[PDB]
Design a protein around this nucleic acid. Structure first.
Lengths: 95, 129, 133, 31
RNA sequence: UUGAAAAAAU
RNA sequence: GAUCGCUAUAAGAUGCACGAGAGCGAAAGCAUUUUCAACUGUGUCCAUUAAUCAAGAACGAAAGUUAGGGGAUCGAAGACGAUCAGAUACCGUCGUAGUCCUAACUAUAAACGAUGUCAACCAAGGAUUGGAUGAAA
RNA sequence: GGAGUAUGGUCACAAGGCUGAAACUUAAAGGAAU
């Protein structure tokens, strides 16, 4: 029956948590049950950073990076290959 | 011809602004410039200034960058921001402040010496209106 | 010769709005009220599925450079942005393609910045409880 | 515990550590 | 992006 | 004269990042900054006043009902366009009730820890929230 | 299974809630693991 001891969430001593929106589907998912991923990406990819630095109007400009936190529902997480169906013993692993 | 009616003006003078030639020059324009360009120094690059023919604002890059996952964010109002910092000998991962402690903390920001209340490192003024 | 309304070298601001359905290459002056040239990805292709492709985005980014050079603008401040109101804050495939194509045309690139609108506290999102099945 | 110790005659140090009501004969920590 | 169905007892 | 860009308005609604197997609450539930409960402390007081409870009584998500205000977004009903053998569905667009506040109802949920309340004993270990207590400045 | 159904009572403006069977039918219905 019980596939998980925490029932898949991360909520222990509360009764309710606010919903959030899956980043790919817009499905209402609880905050603690959401699959949370943090992405830091350069605005300019490695294939173009040469051209940008080449004809640049500044002297020592340091290119910035984005910072967005993504939350997925379970169905979108698995399908998007963010997370996989692990082994029965590997489920307990939490690293 | 679409541009034959255009005239150019001037405002470190940081740049030029186009305007339609007068007919039967209007210029409360708002210009957003970087503090690095104004002071010709890259140490001021994380700021944006507004001028009206006004206000300032932290750049969007910097504001996202200085938000850390396991600390406490403190804001007030002139908008100020802050974050409780770690310590050299600190071992536990999360350094949160109490609610009672937080209310005490509510060109250079040295605001920090609140160092007698908690450990703070990332103190900025993110906006002026 | 010198086109009326043109000047010497000058600084513009290039707002690139790349969703997954289209891409806008819009350049204005430093103020942001007068626009030099605005070319989307749709005005460069026939099929509606190519309104956002890198080729359409890059091709539209070449005429913008040509017009800017004629009108005296030589350097642009890039301001990248995607449809990030409440929907995906990820700029589409043509976001980088247009940006590189601007710098590939000997056009000096000033400060770059992501101005995708991040909501502080937003309204409801389209789709319902169960998302888009 | 698993390592069993004497209960009737607690050590001098051990009764200093334990809670005031959990000593063999509860005594206060005041004067 | 589309893919519905497979009689009863052995 | 759309999409797009800068600048200003007025409501409505929301309360990101911080935000966590963290906190509080009898449960439902509670996130912008500026009366009550509980834990620790105690050579303070009372002295069995306690536990569980048919009947009975408060609170009780969401939806729903009635009457006002509000009415931005989304959207049971509904209208179109697709896909299909058909589509009255998933997909796209528009949109009434509803989603918000006030007053009165309703009293149900996969109301879940599917684990009644109270008490005694009970292997090893790391970590955490709030006090008390030594050292460490 | 019939069934939270029929009837009786009661609560609500209403949807409904609470209390709540029987006739009849059938050799399984179900739980965890290989």
């Amino acid at each position: 029956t019980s596939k998980r001891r925490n029932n898949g969430r991360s909520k222990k001593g509360r009764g309710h948590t606010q919903n959030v929106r899956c980043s790919h589907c817009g499905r209402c998912v609880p905050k603690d049950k959401a699959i949370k991923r943090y992405q830091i990406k350069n605005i300019v990819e490695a294939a173009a950073v040469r051209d940008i630095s080449d004809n640049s109007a500044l002297t020592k400009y340091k290119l910035p990076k984005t910072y967005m936190k993504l939350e997925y529902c379970v169905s979108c997480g698995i399908h998007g290959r963010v997370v996989r169906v692990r082994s029965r013993t590997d489920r307990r692993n939490r690293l | 011809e679409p541009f034959s009616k255009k005239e150019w003006y001037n405002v470190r003078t940081v740049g030029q602004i186009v305007v339609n030639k007068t007919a039967g020059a209007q210029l409360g324009r708002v210009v957003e410039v970087n503090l690095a360009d104004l002071m010709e120094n890259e140490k001021f690059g994380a700021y944006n200034y507004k001028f009206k023919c006004h206000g300032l604002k932290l750049t969007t890059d910097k504001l996202r960058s200085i938000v850390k996952k396991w600390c406490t964010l403190i804001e007030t109002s002139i908008f100020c921001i802050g974050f409780t910092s770690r310590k050299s000998n600190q071992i536990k991962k999360t350094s949160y402040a109490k609610s009672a402690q937080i209310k005490k903390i509510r060109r250079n920001p040295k605001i920090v010496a609140c160092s007698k209340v908690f450990s703070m490192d990332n103190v900025y003024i993110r906006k002026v209106k | 010769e010198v086109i009326p309304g043109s000047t010497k070298d000058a600084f513009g601001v290039a707002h690139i709005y790349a969703t997954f359905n289209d891409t806008f290459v819009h350049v204005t002056d430093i103020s942001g009220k007068e626009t030099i040239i605005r070319i989307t990805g749709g005005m460069r292709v026939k099929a509606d599925r190519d309104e956002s492709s890198p080729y359409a985005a890059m091709t539209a980014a070449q005429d913008v450079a040509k017009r800017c050079k004629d009108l005296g603008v030589t350097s642009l401040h890039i301001k990248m942005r995607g449809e990030g109101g409440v929907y995906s804050k990820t700029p589409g495939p043509g976001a980088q393609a247009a940006l590189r194509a601007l710098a590939r045309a000997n056009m000096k690139i000033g400060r770059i910045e992501d101005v995708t609108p991040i909501p502080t506290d937003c309204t409801k999102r389209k789709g319902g409880r169960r998302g888009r099945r | 515990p698993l390592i069993e110790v004497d209960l009737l005659n607690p050590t001098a140090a051990s009764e200093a550590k334990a809670h005031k009501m959990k000593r063999l004969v509860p005594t206060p920590n005041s004067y």
